[PDB]
Design a protein around this ligand. Structure first.
Ligand SMILES: *[C@@H]1O[C@H](CO)[C@@H](O)[C@H](O)[C@H]1NC(C)=O
Lengths: 50, 48
């Protein structure tokens, strides 16, 4: 799974089967990292109009 | 892939199924790759 974003701590209580997370608009918002099993929130990198 | 979804619910109804909502969490994702068309459940006898 490839993508770009900032990985931050999260407070989402994932169930054991659950691996990643999707927001209202269906964009992936969090992922569970292998090896360490932690849940990292994915927030899109800042962009805007110059 | 043979998917087993499971849920355990504490109930106190005597005879029929309870009426309510309970989502089944996925329990086992099983890699078998075989044809299944018929099944049979296993019970336990009591000997005295
Ligand atoms: C390796 O990954 C497994 C699950 O993918 C995990 O249970 C285990 O702790 C990991 N081991 C190390 C040394 O990261």
């Amino acid at each position: 799974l490839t993508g770009t974003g900032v990985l931050t701590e999260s407070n989402k209580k994932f169930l054991p089967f659950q691996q990643f997370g999707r927001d209202i608009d269906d964009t992936t918002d969090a992922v569970r990292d292998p090896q360490t099993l932690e849940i990292l929130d994915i927030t899109p990198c800042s962009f805007g109009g110059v | 892939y043979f998917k087993i979804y499971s849920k355990h619910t504490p109930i106190n109804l005597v005879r029929d199924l309870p009426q309510g909502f309970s989502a089944l969490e996925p329990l086992v994702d099983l890699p078998i790759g075989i044809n299944i068309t018929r099944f049979q459940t296993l019970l336990a006898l009591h000997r005295s």
